[model samples]
Target chain A: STRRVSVRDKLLVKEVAELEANLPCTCKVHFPDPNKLHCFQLTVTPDEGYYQGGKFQFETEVPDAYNMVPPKVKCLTKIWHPNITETGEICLSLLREHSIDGTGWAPTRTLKDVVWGLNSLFTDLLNFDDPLNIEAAEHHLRDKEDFRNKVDDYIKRYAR
Target chain B: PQNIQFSPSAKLQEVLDYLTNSASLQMKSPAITATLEGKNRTLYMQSVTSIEERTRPNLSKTLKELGLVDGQELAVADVTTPQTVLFKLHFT
Candidate 1:
C-alpha cells in the first residue's frame, strides 16, 4: 500500500461532490488541481445585497481532520463591509474550531453549509450584531444614505 | 490519476476491486478499509475492523443503484483508520 489517503481527503471527495452537485446562483468554485480536491477557490458575485453587482473572491483550506474542524476561509477581494474586513478577513461563527457558542463547527456540518453561509454573508437580512469592521457597522447604524455612498465608493475603487 | 470505465448497471464490486487492488489496499486486515461515497450514499465494500467489527454491506449494489451516473465522480476513502484519532484523541 504505497498510496496513503488521509481522512480529510477521503471526506473531501464526498463533500466536494455535494458542493458541486448544487450551488447557489451567486457563487462559483474552482480547483487548481481537480485531481486533488482539497484546495479550491470560491468566488461570490452578489447581485441583491449591500455589495450588489460586486465580484468577491474567497479561498478555502480544509484541514486533514475535516468535519472535526471547519475549513479556513480567506477573502482575496478588497471590500467595505461590517462582517468582512478591508484586508480580506471575515467573521463567520461556523468556521470557528473552538467556541462555547452552539453555532461553532460540528462533525455533522458539511462543506455545503460553509458555501451557503458564505453566500448568505453578502445579504443584509441578518443583523450585524458582531460586525468585524466596527467602523463600517457604525456608519451603517449612524445613517443609511451615506452608507450606500461609502459602499459605492468602495465598489468603484477596490471591488471588481 | 487513472481513468477507467464501468457500466452503470455493473456491480460496484467490480469497481471496488479495481480501486482497492490498484491502491494495494489490505482487504482483510485492520490496516485499511476503503469506502465508496456518492451523493447521499456510502458503501463499505471492504470489511472494517476498528474497535468494532463493521462489515461490508453494499457489496452487491450496482453503480447506478448507489446513485452514480455516467462520467460522474465517486468518492472513495479509508474510513476505518480515521476513527483512531477522530474519537479517541483529546479534544482541545
Candidate 2:
C-alpha cells in the first residue's frame, strides 16, 4: 500500500509479461541492474526481409508513466532507415503525443505494439511520408536508388 | 417548438472570439506543419493546446462567456477537452 506505484506502471508490467509471451521474433528484454537506476535493454531480431541479418538494440527509459504513455526508446545500434536517425532517435507516430493521426490514443496501446511497429517499419516500410529526416524522406520519395545506396552504406558501417 | 427568438449573448461571443483567435495563431505557427480548416478559420493543432492537457476556452467556459440567460441552456457537444477545436460559426 505504501509503494509509489501508478496506473501507468501497473499497465507497463502487464505489457511486459504479454510481450514476453507473444512477440514473433527472438526478442529479449532485461532490467540489467536495479540498483543503479531503472534501465531496460531490448535486443530484437527483425523477422526476415530487407533487415534479415540485422540485430537491433534499443535502450528504453521508462519514466513514471509507462503504460498510458510510451517508454523513451532510443536505438543503441544505428540503422539506415527512414524511421530511425543516426542519433538513435526513432520517428514513430505513437511516440509523438502531439501528432494526432485521426486514430486517437487508447489506454489499450501496449508496449508490444510500439516494439512490433518499430521492427515492422525497419523490415518492410521505408516510408517517405512524414519522415523526421527531411533528406531521408526526399531520398525515399524522389530518388529511390540513392536511398538504397545510403541504406547499404549504413548497413556496411553499422551492421555486422 | 415556439417561433420565439433570442439575441446573441455577448459572453458566448467573447469566448468564441478568444478561442477562434487563439486557433488562428496556432494555424500560422511553424511548429504545426499542416493546416486543418474548421467552420470559421484554419487551425494549427499544436499551439492552442495547454500544458496540463487542457485547451483554453473550454466548452463550459465558452458557453458561460456567451452570456446565455440560463446557465443550463449552455451546452457543449461533440468534442473533448484538451483537443484543438477550431471554429467557423454560422448564424440562423
Candidate 3:
C-alpha cells in the first residue's frame, strides 16, 4: 500500500460504496470524477414535503480529515428554506464542530448521515424551530399560505 | 466482560495503556481511542476526535483535563493498526 493513501482515501472506498448501496429514493449522488470521490454532486427530489415536485441540487466536499470531520455541503439550487440560505449556507447542527448539545461532528458519523440529513431537511427534518434565514422562518410563521407561495415562486425560478 | 476502571486524575495515557493492554488478550497490536461521557457536549480526545486539539494531548495528558466528572463513563475503542477491509477495488 502506498503511504500517500490517506485514511480519508481508505475510508471513502468503503463509505462511498455504502453510500451508493443504500442511498435514499429522495436523493441521487453523482461523482464528477471517479477518482475524486471526495467531491461529488447530490440531487434531492423531495416528494413528501412542501418542497414536493422541486428538485434541489447540492454539492458536498469531504475534507482530508474525512469521517473525523463533517463534510462541507452547500446547496447549488436556490430555494426559500428556513434552515438553508438562498446563498447556499446551511444550518445543520450535525455539521457544526463541537456543538454544545453533542449534536456536532463525530468520527462515527459518515457521509451517508450527511446525505440522509440533507434529504430529511425537506421532510421531517425541516426545522422552523431553528433557521438560518430570519425572513424565511418568520415569513413561514407570519403567513403560512404566502410563505408557500414564495417557496413555490422560488421553485419555479430556481430549484425546479 | 472486558472492563477497565479509573480513578481521579487518571492520566488519559494511563487509561489508553490499560485499554491497549487489556485488549492484547484478543488480537494483534491496536491503538485506543477515547471519548468521555459528559453532562454537556461529549469530550473528544485530540486524535480520533472530530474536534481539533494540538499535539493530540496523549503526548502525555490526563482525562481530567477533559472536564470529566465522577461516575462518568469513558468509551474506549480499539482500532487495530493497519485495519484491513477487503472489497472489489474500483477506479481506473
Candidate 4:
C-alpha cells in the first residue's frame, strides 16, 4: 500500500519544521487548528522603533497554491502604519500579483521570508512611497513629530 | 555553482525575477533569451509573457527531466545583447 501527499502539504510541513526550529525571539507563531496548516497567527513585539514595546498581531493565510503564490498577510492589531491599513490589509509589493514587471510573487519566496519581512517593516523598513494608510504616510513624511506622538499614543492606548 | 529552491509549478518568469533580485542577472528589457546548455534548449522571449509560459519543475523533477541525478551540474544562461549572465546549478 502506498500513500500520496500533496506538494503543498510537503511544503507546509517543511515550513512548520523550519519555523519551530528557529522562531524569532521577537515573535511567536500560533496555529488555530493544528490539522489546518493554511492559516496561522504571528505576534510581534518590537524592541525598537516607533512601535517599540507594543505587541502587534498578524494573521497569515497560505493559499492552496502555496509557494507558487505569495501568502496573504494581514495585521490583526489595529495600529498606525503606512504600509498596513486600519482594516489589516498589508501593502507589501512582494505579497501581491502584478501583471507589469513581474516583481511581486516568486516561487523561491518562503514563509520565513514573510515573517522576517514583517519584522523588518515594523522596525526600519517601512515603505513610504507606496502605502496602504495614506494618512499615516503623509503624517510620517510631512509632520514627523506628530507621527511619532500618534504612534506613541496608539501604543499606549491600544497596545497595552 | 549555486543551489536554488523553488516550487515544482514555478514558471520561468518567477525564476527570472529571483535571478534578477539576487543580482545574478540584469534584465534590461522584458524581451530576453534563455539557453540550457546540456539539453541544448533555447527559449526566446518577446516579453515576460514568454517566460511566464515556461515551467521549470522542482529541483528533483528538473534533474530527472535533464537525465541526471543528485550531484550533477546544469548550466543555464540568460542573454540580452551586451549582457549575458551564466548560472550553474548543482543538483543535490
Candidate 5:
C-alpha cells in the first residue's frame, strides 16, 4: 500500500504500463484497489509446460526504489520451487542486498535481471539442492522417477 | 527493458561476446567444462572458452538489455591459474 507515499508516481506508472504492454506471459493483474496501495492480484494460466492450464496467484509490491531495486513479489499460491518458500520468502540472489556476495547475491545485479530470473524459476530454479520444502526436495532427489510421474499426474489432474 | 530487435546472427554474436567476457576469470580454450550437482536430480553444465580480448561494461549491459545474463561461473577452479573459470548455464 502506498499509504500516501508518492515518491515516483510517474515512474511507477510508466513501468507498470510497460510491463502490461509487453505481456510476455499469460498472466493478468486484478487490482482490487488501485488508489490505496496499487494492490495487484495475478492469476497465471500456465502455458506450454507441465503446469499448463493450472492457475497460480501472486502479488507484487512496488516499492519506492523500484527501478533501482527489485520489486517485492510474493506467490500467493503454493508452488514446488526451491527459491520460493511456503511463506512466500524468495531465496534469490537478486533479492538480497547487492553487496552480499557471500549469500549468493552479487553486487552487479539489476532489477531487470531479477524479473528475468523469476520468469525462469518455473523450470531452472526448482531444483532440490536448495529446496523450499525438505520433503519435496527428497521426493525430487531420491525418487525422481516417481516425482516426474507425480508431476505428470498433477498436470493431468489440473489440466482443463 | 523492451526487447530490442536483432537478427539471429546478431543474437549469436551477442551470446558469444557474453561467453567471452563479463566473467571474473577467462578460460583458455573450448575444452573446459563446468558442472554443478544438487538435490532433486538437478544438473547444471556449460562449456568454457577463452578470449584474447577483454570486453567493455556496455557489452554486459547490452546482453542484459537483450534479457541474457551471464550465468557462467568464473573463478579459481585449481591453484595453477589465477583466472580459471567454472562456467554454469542453468539451461544449456
Candidate 6:
C-alpha cells in the first residue's frame, strides 16, 4: 500500500502537536481544521520593542516540501517594519530556501525554531540589512525618532 | 521594453534570473504580475530568496496548464513596476 504522506508532513503534525501542548504565553496558534494541517494562524503580542503591546497576527502556509523549504509566512495584521512588507510578506534568512552559499532554511530547523525566529524578529533580532521594506529600513537608519513615530502610529492604527 | 529568448524547458525562476542579471530588471516585490489576453496571474516570488520555492511551473508547462495556446504573447512585469513599465515575452 503506497500512500503519499511525506516525511515533512509527519514532522509538521508532530511539531505542531508539541507546540499546542506547550503554547507560549506571548503567542497563540489556531488551526482552522484539525485534519487539514496545511495552514495555521499565529498571533503574537510583543512585550518589548516598537511593537510592544501590539497583537499581531500571521498566517503560515506549509508547502509540501516543509522542512526542506521554509513555510510561507504573511503578517495578516499590517505593521510598519523594515523586514516585513505592508502586504505582510516577511523577509527573514531562516525562512529563505538554502542558497549556493548554504545559508537559509535547513532540515534541522523545526517549527519551534520558526515561532522563536518570528518572536525574535518582532523583538531583538531585527535585521536592517537586506530589508524587504527599503523605506522602513532607511527611516530606521536615518531617523530613529521618525521611525519610532511611524511605528507608534502603526501600532495605534492597526495593532490595537 | 525588451524581449529575451528562452527554452520551453526553462523554469520561470531561470527566466526571472536572466531578466534580472542580463535584462537589468528589478524584482523587489513578492510576486510578478503576468498578463496574457486580458487574463492576469501573479507568480509568487521573493527578491532575496530562491524563486524555485514559490512552486511556479516552467514556461511551456504553465502555458499548457493554463490552456494558453502556443505563440501567444505574454506581458510580464514586476509587482512594484509602475503603470508605465511594461516587459513583453513571446512564446514560440
Worst 10 residues of 1 chain B by lDDT: B83-92
- Candidate 6 differs from the real structure by a C-alpha RMSD in angstroms, to one decimal, of 18.2
Per-residue C-alpha lDDT of model 3 across residues B1-92, encoded as one tens digit per residue? 13456655567566545544655533222223222231112122222112213224442555556554544433322233233232121111
Over the full model, what C-alpha lDDT does candidate 6 score relative to the true structure? 0.63
Task: Quote each prediction's TM-score.
Answer: 0.63, 0.53, 0.63, 0.59, 0.48, 0.59
Model 1, span A1-160: residue lDDT tens: 2223456755664565446546788888876644445677888888786788888889898876678888989988887788888898878888886567888889988888888888888984334687889898898889978998988888888766
Could you say which candidate leads in DockQ?
A: 1
Number of clashes in every candidate structure? 0, 7, 0, 0, 1, 0
User: How accurate locally is residue B19 in candidate 3, as Cα lDDT from 0 to 100?
Assistant: 42
lDDT of 5 by residue, A42-82 (tens): 55665655455666566767566554565677877555545
Sliding window of 10 residues with minimal summed lDDT for model 4 chain A = A1-10
Ranking by TM-score: 3, 1, 4, 6, 2, 5
Encode model 3's per-residue lDDT on A97-158: one tens digit a residue.
86568988989888889998898889887888868898898999989999999999999999
TM-score-superior candidate, 2 or 5: 2
When 3 and 6 are scored with TM-score, the better candidate is: 3
lDDT by residue (tens digit), candidate 6, B51-76: 32333443325434543343433334
DockQ of each: 0.06, 0.01, 0.02, 0.02, 0.01, 0.01
lDDT of 1 at A88: 81
Q: Clash pairs of candidate 6?
A: none
Tens-digit lDDT string for candidate 4 (A38-134): 5778888988888889888999988877888889888888888998887788877778775695767788877778887788778666777777789
Q: In model 6, what is the error at residue B10, expressed in angstroms?
A: 55
TM-score of chain B of each: 0.50, 0.19, 0.46, 0.38, 0.21, 0.49
Look at candidate 3 and tell me the lDDT of residue A48.
Answer: 83
In order, what fnat does every candidate score? Answer: 0.06, 0.00, 0.00, 0.00, 0.00, 0.00
| Model 5 backbone overlap count | 1
In candidate 4, position A90 carries an lDDT of 83
